[PDB]
Amino acid sequence: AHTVKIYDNCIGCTQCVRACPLDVLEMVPWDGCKAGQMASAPRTEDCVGCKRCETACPTDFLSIRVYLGGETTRSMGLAY
Amino acid sequence: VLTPCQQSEAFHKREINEVRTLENRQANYEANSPSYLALQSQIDQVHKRFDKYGTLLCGQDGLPHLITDGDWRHAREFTIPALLFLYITGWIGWVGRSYLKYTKETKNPTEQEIILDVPMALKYMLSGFLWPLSAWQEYRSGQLLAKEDEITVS
Amino acid sequence: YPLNPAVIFIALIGWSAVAAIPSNIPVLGGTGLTQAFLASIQRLLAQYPTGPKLDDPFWFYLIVYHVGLFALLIFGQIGYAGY
Amino acid sequence: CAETEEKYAMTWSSDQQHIFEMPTGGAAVMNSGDNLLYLARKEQALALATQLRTQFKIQDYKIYRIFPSGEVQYLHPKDGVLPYQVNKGREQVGRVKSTIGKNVNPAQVKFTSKATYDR
Amino acid sequence: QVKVVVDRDVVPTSFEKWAKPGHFSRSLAKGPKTTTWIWNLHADAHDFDSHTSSLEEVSRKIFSAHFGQLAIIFIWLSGMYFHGARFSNYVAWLSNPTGIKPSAQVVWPIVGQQILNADVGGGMQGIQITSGLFQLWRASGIVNELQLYVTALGGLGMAGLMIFAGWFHYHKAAPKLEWFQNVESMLNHHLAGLLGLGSLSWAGHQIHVSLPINKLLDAGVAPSSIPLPHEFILNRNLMAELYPSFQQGLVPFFTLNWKQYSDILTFKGGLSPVTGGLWLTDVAHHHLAIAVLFLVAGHMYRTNWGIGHSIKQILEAHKGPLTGEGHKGLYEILTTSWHANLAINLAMLGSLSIIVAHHMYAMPPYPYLATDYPTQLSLFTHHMWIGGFCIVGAGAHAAIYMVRDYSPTVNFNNVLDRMIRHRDAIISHLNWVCIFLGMHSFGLYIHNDTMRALGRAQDMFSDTAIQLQPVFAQWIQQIHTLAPGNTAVNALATASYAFGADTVTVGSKIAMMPIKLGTADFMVHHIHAFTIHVTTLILLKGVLYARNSRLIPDKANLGFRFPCDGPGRGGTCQVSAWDHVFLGLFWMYNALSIVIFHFSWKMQSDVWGTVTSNGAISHITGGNFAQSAITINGWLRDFLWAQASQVIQSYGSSLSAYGLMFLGAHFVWAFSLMFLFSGRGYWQELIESIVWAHNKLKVAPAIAPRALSITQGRAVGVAHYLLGGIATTWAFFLARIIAVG
Amino acid sequence: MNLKKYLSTAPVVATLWLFLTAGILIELNRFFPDSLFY
Amino acid sequence: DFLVHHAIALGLHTTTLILVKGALDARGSKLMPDKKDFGYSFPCDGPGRGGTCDISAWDAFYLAMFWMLNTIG
Amino acid sequence: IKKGSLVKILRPESFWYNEVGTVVNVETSKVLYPVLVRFDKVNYSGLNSTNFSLDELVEIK
Ligand code: CLA
Ligand code: CLA
Ligand code: CLA
Ligand code: CLA
Ligand code: CLA
Ligand SMILES: CC1=C(C/C=C(\C)CCC[C@H](C)CCC[C@H](C)CCCC(C)C)C(=O)c2ccccc2C1=O
Ligand code: SF4
Ligand code: SF4
Ligand code: SF4
């Protein structure tokens, strides 16, 4: 699968989950930031890899870095 | 071999051929046509064109070549407009550098570059005239350069 | 959707009879639009390999008769729109 | 097709018969009481979730993923609350300790079946 | 109802907001922290449906902007009338048009470029016109320089009325939206008032100016014995000599004895055998037919008086069964969304311009227009090219409707979105037609290419070989031969001499020859149907997949000029509804490049050229089309290698500026490829690696130097591919036909 | 009042300087044409 | 000889500009310094951060092939 | 250290690496990246406002 990794720069502004149109990303309460939040990517089996998250990631440089991995039916986004 | 151009054969062949060829259109008009006077001025601007290329070097092609060695006999060919040119874009470059180190310390450096402050612009446009011994004396203060600016990973 | 596949021949009544008696002479057909066609198909119908591009009343009254005949049968199925 | 690919049937309810836009295209009838909606892929479905949720209230909505064996799944939400909102049930997976700046060089990963970031 | 509510003192007129670039966009009034603000300043200069959603303020902005466009057009035509006045040889051209080549622009004498001043005759030199202004002035009856000066100064006068009108209609009297959605009145005044009184008043100009003047110039009168158009209306006596129906006055008009007006008006067709143009009796009669016919046409829209239609009750009445709802919604689409109106009007405007090209080559309507072949070529070619680009503007602004201004509530089950329900079945059959026509339009050329290259010319598609004689075009052209006796009963000659009788020659120059269409002309028409179907594929794929595709199901959430989605779905570069227009501009270049490469080479083989003694024939290439258009080596060799030779040897002469705009246009064409192939992920840190070299010398620019964005970094590849690609054929064509014709 | 700010922007002063040096080149190439020396 | 040999040195220094660019910014650039992680010829970084068409070290080959054919041309 | 201090960075994937910047907010609640630093110039995300840890907190005098 397209392995999404979410590093410790994630200050939890949640433009990533609102920017992902696939709900691979959710927010996890993590007591290491000011908002107490840090994003998680549990459901990367549906991850397209369109990097619409990384556009809307206002950290220093890309707390959430999408690595293009496997290519299944769902991860290739073919309709048929 | 670069012959001196005032005596080369194919040079004067181009003289006869272009004065005659452009002259062929001059017999298409009367003695007081405005075009006929214009081709009088053009024939003048061809004989002057070929007399003012006398001290060049046209080889077997009949076309005036150049020399860029700094032989000091070819200094009016290359090196005098070379030093002249380097003075002119040393002017331009020192104007632009001096204006950017102006607007770097202002209120809003973004609005400074759309709308040029023609007061301070035309200050630096004219003040950057003596950039060798002004840029050089700002180099001896260790200020033309910089250190520890942006870079990638290594 | 085509609930009324009723009649087609009412266009053949409706397009030939409106185009037979108006001759309007000095055109290709000195007779009407259809009389210049039915006479100019019976000369070619008995397996004649002729009828080139210079055969005027076969091709020209082919297309000009089919283009009004198509229009009047289509408008005949529009004659089952008010139901 | 439906006999070999995971059809995505989106089930949701509403209050009034509005009109939304299909991801296949055009306007849809939008049954007011309760309506399911078969689709082709997930981005169509959550793009429709953005299509309706950013306009108005369409909550109690989620696609039941019809995988071709026959049964369903449930993803958005799972704990019942919206994903960018924070619930105390989700376990974070997919992190490392620092930025990319401490990720390993790929000559240290060469001839090994590792990642450029696991360390 | 119809009433005009106008806001007064809308916007103050100080120069304050000129000091705020990007005042208009709150998304862009932050100021440039990067250089992408510079280009987004110009990419949002006319996104009027992106400034504010309020259609009143938008509609004021556009309606005032049109007057700026008409101001630039009146500056342009006043420029053409002044360059006709002071600089042209038009007065001397009016004496002998077949000998004197038309020139207006007289190049200033700087280094060398005074040699561009071509001695075209008339005693005065300058670079040769190909725009054909002198033919429209001989048709319009402009005699001496005085009407060119005065009409130029009236052009500046109307330019002042359009600047003052646009300022007046944005700032100190600007209307409401209820004025604009009053569209039955808008059609009611444009069909009748604009076009109706335009064609009627132009029939006035032709009957009271051109018919006496181009009867006298048809009689060969020098431009000194010709009286002014002034002097034909003080008395009918100077026109009753020329046309003896003016003696009866308007009395046979009001008694409907219009048989009496056979002098002024007739239906002859053909061409004038003396001037090589249309009969201005036919053209003036024609503008009367547009006059009465359009003034009939204007009065079918109910505005205040309860007489006429409304568009709503028309579009509702076509409630067809296979569409379900009928055309319900389109009066609300086309009166609330401007971009849809721009799609329709650019489609019909562009196709009108193509229609203009095809009607000007074969029925050359101006006197001595088909004599000078460059004005005959480049007025086909130019109107073909804008006639192309406007169709891509239809394919763009249809998509700009579909992305921004689509609303499924007003647009539910009607004729529109029921297409989008089966847009797979639209685009899939365009895909099939494109492949089928590509095989059967270009595979025939690879066939004849191989069979000629394999020696077996017995297996080609020539007239000698396996022929592909176009049956339908030759048949209907044969009908057009048989028009003026049979069906056009009151005609004399055909609709053109591209159809029927033997050729018309003026001054030993072939004005129009009947065009023969055999087995090569066939295959080039299938080129044209093919590359038309490909642009229709990209510009319907750009509209039906504009708002929500099945690849990307939220494009309206992304926009119109978005570049992409990402590398997901295996890469989704170039997927927006703008990017299809990016592609349709290259296919515009293809399709029109082979339209004009059909035109300028069939009519250098089958029409143009000279005639010699005993009426004998001579074409320019000499009949070298049907034996040579069937291949590509015949096409590239015998056309692009052979017709280039007068562009390439053009140095040392007045045609050398085309020898510069030929190579420089190869440069711009080749320079587009740098923008098309690469992308800003290279150039951004190439540039930032140069920003190191500015940060070292403290020459860091305060506006941060980004590279271009993606959509700009491909839009500029289009706009260089087309500027260089179009200016190559421009310089090639005008340097070809000026060198002979 | 604020017109002089518009006449201080980047493209307008770009034309009022490249127009000016353009006139330096053209007016310096009408008076002394064909200048390959010096 | 003079003019062409300047055009050839133009072709070489451009082609090595591409190659030394995408061979020393092959590892890390200030657009994305993660370029060591995605391997050699990864497609892009998506539209984020301005747009990222052809950031990879495969653009050195990709563009320097066009400049190679130009120069040997 | 404090708010308003002019701070050079020593992290190689910072866009403003070896460029000074102003401190806006510092939290003392063991956040791993507490020191919010914004800058004059602007990265490719359009955003000068970032945050850092304490090892990458080098001031000037
Ligand atoms: C402020 C003016 C200025 C100055 C002093 C420099 C100086 C330099 N640039 Mg340059 N550059 C500038 C503006 C300037 N640039 C602009 C506006 C652009 C965008 C077109 C570039 C694009 C550019 C590139 C792409 C490259 C350089 C490079 C270089 C370096 C090598 C010299 C060279 O070939 O220049 C190059 C000169 C040009 C490309 C054309 C000149 C640019 C304009 C036309 C003239 C600048 C005058 C300025 C606009 C005046 C404004 C201020 C005034 C109104 C008050 C040198 C440090 C090179 C480098 O890194 O070498 C180490 C390199 O590869 N520059
Ligand atoms: C019969 C009256 C009439 C006439 C002649 C026109 C003519 C025109 N309209 Mg128009 N219009 C009219 C009524 C009329 N309109 C009405 C009633 C409405 C409201 C429903 C509109 C709404 C409208 C819009 C929204 C737009 C136009 C535009 C245009 C121009 C198209 C460009 C063209 O063909 O250039 C050819 C140019 C000419 C033939 C020159 C025409 C100038 C003469 C003198 C007629 C103008 C008289 C003027 C309208 C009277 C105003 C009264 C006032 C002075 C008291 C053209 C000038 C478009 C345009 O370009 O905007 C200007 C445009 O976008 N019109
Ligand atoms: C009797 C009036 C009249 C006259 C003298 C002309 C004369 C001319 N027209 Mg024409 N035209 C007319 C009426 C007229 N037109 C009408 C009413 C229309 C609108 C339908 C047009 C539309 C038109 C176009 C689109 C073009 C011309 C062109 C021309 C010129 C070509 C020479 C030729 O042989 O054309 C002879 C003209 C004809 C054979 C046209 C006959 C049109 C009839 C009168 C239409 C009757 C209207 C009625 C509703 C029936 C429509 C359906 C019908 C076909 C069954 C010539 C000057 C061409 C041009 O611009 O020249 C360069 C051109 O491209 N005309
Ligand atoms: C000369 C280069 C070239 C060629 C040949 C094509 C060809 C094609 N493009 Mg195209 N295109 C090109 C450049 C080219 N493009 C460029 C430069 C752009 C830049 C903007 C585009 C953009 C573009 C778009 C945007 C689209 C196309 C589409 C198409 C296809 C149209 C359907 C068709 O004609 O099928 C017929 C095929 C041919 C005429 C090719 C020759 C086939 C010969 C005649 C027969 C087979 C040869 C041989 C027997 C094979 C067997 C031997 C072999 C196996 C060993 C067609 C294959 C469209 C598409 O997807 O298809 C509809 C489409 O939407 N193109
Ligand atoms: C796509 C365009 C095209 C066309 C139409 C042709 C046609 C032809 N080529 Mg050819 N050729 C082409 C492209 C084309 N070529 C290209 C691109 C190349 C170079 C790669 C060549 C290279 C080539 C060579 C080297 C030779 C030919 C030859 C021939 C001829 C005989 C071939 C043959 O037996 O056909 C085979 C035809 C079929 C198998 C029929 C299949 C198509 C049918 C008609 C489809 C019908 C479907 C139907 C309409 C469905 C609807 C009805 C249904 C629903 C009931 C024939 C005239 C030969 C020759 O000597 O010429 C005389 C020969 O030696 N060609
Ligand atoms: C070369 C190139 C660039 C670089 C183009 C640069 C950024 C623009 C160079 C031209 C501008 C206009 C230079 C700016 C100079 C100003 C005009 C100031 C100069 C002074 C006077 C001329 C006014 C891209 O940004 C790009 C993006 C996407 C795909 C391909 C490419 C691409 O091939
Ligand atoms: S990483 Fe960037 S985007 Fe994802 S949550 Fe933290 S801040 Fe919001
Ligand atoms: S990868 Fe594509 S899908 Fe998965 S999060 Fe980043 S953007 Fe949303
Ligand atoms: S940059 Fe090139 S690849 Fe990355 S998304 Fe935009 S287009 Fe697709």
PDB file of N, CA, C and O in Angstrom, chain E residues 564-567 677-682 684-686 688 709-710, chain G residues 21 29-31 35 44 47 49-51 53-55 59 62-63:
ATOM      1  N   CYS E 564      -3.853  19.427 -11.488  1.00  0.00           N
ATOM      2  CA  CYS E 564      -3.738  17.992 -11.291  1.00  0.00           C
ATOM      3  C   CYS E 564      -4.461  17.558 -10.033  1.00  0.00           C
ATOM      4  O   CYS E 564      -5.099  18.371  -9.365  1.00  0.00           O
ATOM      5  N   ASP E 565      -4.317  16.298  -9.655  1.00  0.00           N
ATOM      6  CA  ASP E 565      -4.584  15.910  -8.280  1.00  0.00           C
ATOM      7  C   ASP E 565      -3.317  15.470  -7.568  1.00  0.00           C
ATOM      8  O   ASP E 565      -3.043  15.925  -6.458  1.00  0.00           O
ATOM      9  N   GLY E 566      -2.533  14.598  -8.186  1.00  0.00           N
ATOM     10  CA  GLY E 566      -1.309  14.124  -7.597  1.00  0.00           C
ATOM     11  C   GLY E 566      -0.805  12.896  -8.313  1.00  0.00           C
ATOM     12  O   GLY E 566      -1.350  12.484  -9.339  1.00  0.00           O
ATOM     13  N   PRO E 567       0.247  12.275  -7.779  1.00  0.00           N
ATOM     14  CA  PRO E 567       0.695  10.990  -8.321  1.00  0.00           C
ATOM     15  C   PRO E 567      -0.231   9.842  -8.004  1.00  0.00           C
ATOM     16  O   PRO E 567      -0.020   8.741  -8.528  1.00  0.00           O
ATOM     17  N   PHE E 677       7.674  20.300 -21.800  1.00  0.00           N
ATOM     18  CA  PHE E 677       8.177  18.989 -21.414  1.00  0.00           C
ATOM     19  C   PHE E 677       8.603  18.958 -19.964  1.00  0.00           C
ATOM     20  O   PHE E 677       8.319  17.991 -19.254  1.00  0.00           O
ATOM     21  N   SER E 678       9.308  19.990 -19.523  1.00  0.00           N
ATOM     22  CA  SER E 678       9.809  20.040 -18.167  1.00  0.00           C
ATOM     23  C   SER E 678       8.712  20.503 -17.225  1.00  0.00           C
ATOM     24  O   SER E 678       7.556  20.689 -17.606  1.00  0.00           O
ATOM     25  N   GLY E 679       9.079  20.698 -15.969  1.00  0.00           N
ATOM     26  CA  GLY E 679       8.122  21.216 -15.020  1.00  0.00           C
ATOM     27  C   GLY E 679       8.820  21.907 -13.877  1.00  0.00           C
ATOM     28  O   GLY E 679      10.039  21.826 -13.725  1.00  0.00           O
ATOM     29  N   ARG E 680       8.019  22.565 -13.047  1.00  0.00           N
ATOM     30  CA  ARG E 680       8.579  23.453 -12.047  1.00  0.00           C
ATOM     31  C   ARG E 680       9.291  22.724 -10.918  1.00  0.00           C
ATOM     32  O   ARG E 680       9.988  23.372 -10.135  1.00  0.00           O
ATOM     33  N   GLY E 681       9.157  21.402 -10.816  1.00  0.00           N
ATOM     34  CA  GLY E 681       9.969  20.675  -9.861  1.00  0.00           C
ATOM     35  C   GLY E 681      11.421  20.606 -10.253  1.00  0.00           C
ATOM     36  O   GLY E 681      12.266  20.313  -9.408  1.00  0.00           O
ATOM     37  N   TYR E 682      11.730  20.838 -11.523  1.00  0.00           N
ATOM     38  CA  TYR E 682      13.108  21.086 -11.912  1.00  0.00           C
ATOM     39  C   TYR E 682      13.473  22.544 -11.671  1.00  0.00           C
ATOM     40  O   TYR E 682      14.419  22.861 -10.931  1.00  0.00           O
ATOM     41  N   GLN E 684      12.368  25.004 -10.072  1.00  0.00           N
ATOM     42  CA  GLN E 684      12.240  25.725  -8.816  1.00  0.00           C
ATOM     43  C   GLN E 684      13.528  25.666  -8.010  1.00  0.00           C
ATOM     44  O   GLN E 684      13.930  26.669  -7.406  1.00  0.00           O
ATOM     45  N   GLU E 685      14.219  24.528  -8.013  1.00  0.00           N
ATOM     46  CA  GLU E 685      15.502  24.499  -7.329  1.00  0.00           C
ATOM     47  C   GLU E 685      16.683  24.638  -8.269  1.00  0.00           C
ATOM     48  O   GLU E 685      17.815  24.770  -7.789  1.00  0.00           O
ATOM     49  N   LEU E 686      16.467  24.622  -9.585  1.00  0.00           N
ATOM     50  CA  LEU E 686      17.446  25.287 -10.435  1.00  0.00           C
ATOM     51  C   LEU E 686      17.512  26.763 -10.084  1.00  0.00           C
ATOM     52  O   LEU E 686      18.595  27.314  -9.826  1.00  0.00           O
ATOM     53  N   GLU E 688      16.429  28.164  -7.329  1.00  0.00           N
ATOM     54  CA  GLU E 688      16.907  28.375  -5.965  1.00  0.00           C
ATOM     55  C   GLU E 688      18.409  28.134  -5.848  1.00  0.00           C
ATOM     56  O   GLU E 688      19.087  28.792  -5.041  1.00  0.00           O
ATOM     57  N   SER E 709       4.088  28.457 -12.048  1.00  0.00           N
ATOM     58  CA  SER E 709       3.241  27.365 -11.609  1.00  0.00           C
ATOM     59  C   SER E 709       3.088  26.358 -12.742  1.00  0.00           C
ATOM     60  O   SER E 709       3.629  26.522 -13.835  1.00  0.00           O
ATOM     61  N   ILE E 710       2.329  25.299 -12.490  1.00  0.00           N
ATOM     62  CA  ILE E 710       2.208  24.249 -13.491  1.00  0.00           C
ATOM     63  C   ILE E 710       1.330  24.708 -14.642  1.00  0.00           C
ATOM     64  O   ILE E 710       1.696  24.572 -15.817  1.00  0.00           O
TER      65      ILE E 710
ATOM     66  N   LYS G  21      23.031  19.242 -11.983  1.00  0.00           N
ATOM     67  CA  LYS G  21      21.887  19.661 -11.185  1.00  0.00           C
ATOM     68  C   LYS G  21      21.178  18.446 -10.612  1.00  0.00           C
ATOM     69  O   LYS G  21      21.179  18.236  -9.398  1.00  0.00           O
ATOM     70  N   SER G  29      17.131  18.695  -2.346  1.00  0.00           N
ATOM     71  CA  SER G  29      16.884  20.058  -2.783  1.00  0.00           C
ATOM     72  C   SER G  29      16.099  20.794  -1.706  1.00  0.00           C
ATOM     73  O   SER G  29      15.567  20.186  -0.778  1.00  0.00           O
ATOM     74  N   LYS G  30      16.020  22.118  -1.825  1.00  0.00           N
ATOM     75  CA  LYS G  30      15.227  22.866  -0.858  1.00  0.00           C
ATOM     76  C   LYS G  30      13.750  22.922  -1.210  1.00  0.00           C
ATOM     77  O   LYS G  30      12.960  23.398  -0.391  1.00  0.00           O
ATOM     78  N   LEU G  31      13.349  22.440  -2.386  1.00  0.00           N
ATOM     79  CA  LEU G  31      11.933  22.182  -2.612  1.00  0.00           C
ATOM     80  C   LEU G  31      11.490  21.005  -1.758  1.00  0.00           C
ATOM     81  O   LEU G  31      10.615  21.133  -0.896  1.00  0.00           O
ATOM     82  N   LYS G  35      14.358  13.608  -1.185  1.00  0.00           N
ATOM     83  CA  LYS G  35      14.528  12.993  -2.493  1.00  0.00           C
ATOM     84  C   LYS G  35      15.384  11.741  -2.431  1.00  0.00           C
ATOM     85  O   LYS G  35      15.268  10.876  -3.304  1.00  0.00           O
ATOM     86  N   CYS G  44       6.984  12.447  -8.870  1.00  0.00           N
ATOM     87  CA  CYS G  44       6.797  13.832  -8.459  1.00  0.00           C
ATOM     88  C   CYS G  44       6.633  13.889  -6.950  1.00  0.00           C
ATOM     89  O   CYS G  44       6.840  12.899  -6.241  1.00  0.00           O
ATOM     90  N   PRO G  47       1.046  18.312  -6.301  1.00  0.00           N
ATOM     91  CA  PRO G  47       0.935  19.764  -6.476  1.00  0.00           C
ATOM     92  C   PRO G  47       1.311  20.575  -5.261  1.00  0.00           C
ATOM     93  O   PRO G  47       1.204  21.805  -5.323  1.00  0.00           O
ATOM     94  N   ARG G  49       3.215  22.661  -2.413  1.00  0.00           N
ATOM     95  CA  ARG G  49       4.348  23.574  -2.307  1.00  0.00           C
ATOM     96  C   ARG G  49       4.689  24.185  -3.662  1.00  0.00           C
ATOM     97  O   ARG G  49       5.850  24.262  -4.063  1.00  0.00           O
ATOM     98  N   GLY G  50       3.646  24.599  -4.383  1.00  0.00           N
ATOM     99  CA  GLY G  50       3.762  25.277  -5.647  1.00  0.00           C
ATOM    100  C   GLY G  50       3.479  24.403  -6.851  1.00  0.00           C
ATOM    101  O   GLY G  50       3.061  24.918  -7.892  1.00  0.00           O
ATOM    102  N   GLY G  51       3.692  23.098  -6.730  1.00  0.00           N
ATOM    103  CA  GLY G  51       3.638  22.197  -7.863  1.00  0.00           C
ATOM    104  C   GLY G  51       4.990  21.550  -8.039  1.00  0.00           C
ATOM    105  O   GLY G  51       6.003  22.182  -7.741  1.00  0.00           O
ATOM    106  N   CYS G  53       6.195  19.166 -10.784  1.00  0.00           N
ATOM    107  CA  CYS G  53       6.426  18.392 -11.997  1.00  0.00           C
ATOM    108  C   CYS G  53       7.918  18.162 -12.178  1.00  0.00           C
ATOM    109  O   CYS G  53       8.669  19.123 -12.364  1.00  0.00           O
ATOM    110  N   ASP G  54       8.331  16.892 -12.141  1.00  0.00           N
ATOM    111  CA  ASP G  54       9.681  16.434 -12.485  1.00  0.00           C
ATOM    112  C   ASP G  54      10.743  17.046 -11.570  1.00  0.00           C
ATOM    113  O   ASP G  54      11.585  17.840 -11.983  1.00  0.00           O
ATOM    114  N   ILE G  55      10.664  16.667 -10.298  1.00  0.00           N
ATOM    115  CA  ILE G  55      11.692  17.065  -9.346  1.00  0.00           C
ATOM    116  C   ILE G  55      12.785  16.011  -9.230  1.00  0.00           C
ATOM    117  O   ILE G  55      13.910  16.341  -8.827  1.00  0.00           O
ATOM    118  N   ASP G  59      14.915  13.644 -13.929  1.00  0.00           N
ATOM    119  CA  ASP G  59      14.805  14.760 -14.858  1.00  0.00           C
ATOM    120  C   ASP G  59      16.157  15.164 -15.428  1.00  0.00           C
ATOM    121  O   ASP G  59      16.204  15.859 -16.438  1.00  0.00           O
ATOM    122  N   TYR G  62      16.210  12.964 -18.151  1.00  0.00           N
ATOM    123  CA  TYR G  62      15.056  13.221 -19.001  1.00  0.00           C
ATOM    124  C   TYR G  62      15.238  14.469 -19.840  1.00  0.00           C
ATOM    125  O   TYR G  62      14.995  14.446 -21.044  1.00  0.00           O
ATOM    126  N   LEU G  63      15.699  15.543 -19.232  1.00  0.00           N
ATOM    127  CA  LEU G  63      15.924  16.788 -19.936  1.00  0.00           C
ATOM    128  C   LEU G  63      17.262  16.794 -20.650  1.00  0.00           C
ATOM    129  O   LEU G  63      17.377  17.328 -21.764  1.00  0.00           O
TER     130      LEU G  63
END
